[PDB]
């Protein structure tokens, strides 16, 4: 099994990773789009639903 643990990192904060093994390492950081500065990545405030229906 592989178990994933996550955190939210404030700006200017270091996450320090220390390990002798068994460790699965992040290659990329995930940034929300509704925290963007309107620098055109920015696409604000989604609603996530659970649906069995098609799209239209």
């Amino acid at each position: 099994r592989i178990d994933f643990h996550w955190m939210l990192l404030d700006p200017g904060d270091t996450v320090t990773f220390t390990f002798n093994g068994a460790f699965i390492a992040p290659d990329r950081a995930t940034f929300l789009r509704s925290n963007a500065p309107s620098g055109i990545e920015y696409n604000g405030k989604s609603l996530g639903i659970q649906s069995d229906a098609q799209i239209d």
Binding site: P37, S38, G39, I40, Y42
Partner: protein
């Protein structure tokens, strides 16, 4: 305390990308409290704020333009820049760069640009560049008038000096007129002593950066 000089093409074709740069003198673009802004004014229309950028990365763009505009700060060159994609004739405007100082006691964040550049005109058009032809206006109760005619250039502007920035009092450089040919023309004139026509030198300098043209005309009796 700061000087702000704008630069960029002057002519961009429709659907292409508009890029402008602002050269900053007197302060560093790496300062924590200043923000850098662009504003524009279409010919004969109102001022429209485009956005601000802080060195720390915080930006805000007008929603009318946000899906097409970005800004950046170049710390190495002490510059900041505007990038506007997929332009149309609605984007022909004078573009002003400006500095403001974060001051949340009296102003929303990034919302009070208080040192502006003089603006640079950008024309969105498919027409090609054309340098001016420059012709003299030769002199005929004490005062004589002379000048230079700057005809058939595109797009705007031309700049005119008389004697490289030396003769300055009495100069009138007229707003350009659009001719039926689609090219611009203007005149620059100066008043001088008639007693001066026999012995002293006058050269108008007509400079047009989009066509990389410098033309000197010297003026005198027919």
């Amino acid at each position: 305390q700061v000087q702000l000089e704008e630069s960029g093409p002057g002519l961009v074709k429709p659907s292409e990308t508009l890029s402008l740069t602002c050269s900053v003198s007197g302060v560093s673009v790496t300062s924590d409290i200043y923000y850098w802004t662009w504003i524009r004014q279409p010919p004969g229309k109102g001022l429209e704020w485009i956005g601000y950028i802080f060195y720390n990365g915080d930006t805000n763009y007008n929603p009318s333009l946000k899906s097409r505009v970005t800004m950046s700060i170049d710390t190495s060159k002490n510059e900041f820049s505007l990038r506007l994609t997929s332009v149309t004739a609605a984007d022909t405007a004078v573009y002003f760069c400006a500095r403001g100082t974060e001051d949340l006691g009296y102003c929303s964040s990034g919302s009070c640009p208080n040192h502006w550049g003089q603006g640079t005109l950008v024309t969105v058009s498919s027409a090609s560049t054309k340098g001016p032809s420059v012709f003299p206006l030769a002199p005929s109760g004490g005062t004589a008038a002379l000048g230079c005619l700057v005809k058939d250039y595109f797009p705007e502007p031309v700049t005119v000096s008389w004697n490289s920035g030396a003769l300055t009092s009495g100069v009138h450089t007229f707003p350009a007129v659009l001719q039926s040919s689609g090219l611009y023309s203007l005149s620059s004139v100066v008043t001088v002593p008639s007693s001066s026509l026999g012995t002293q030198t006058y050269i108008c300098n007509v400079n047009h950066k989009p066509s990389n043209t410098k033309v000197d005309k010297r003026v005198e009796p027919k």
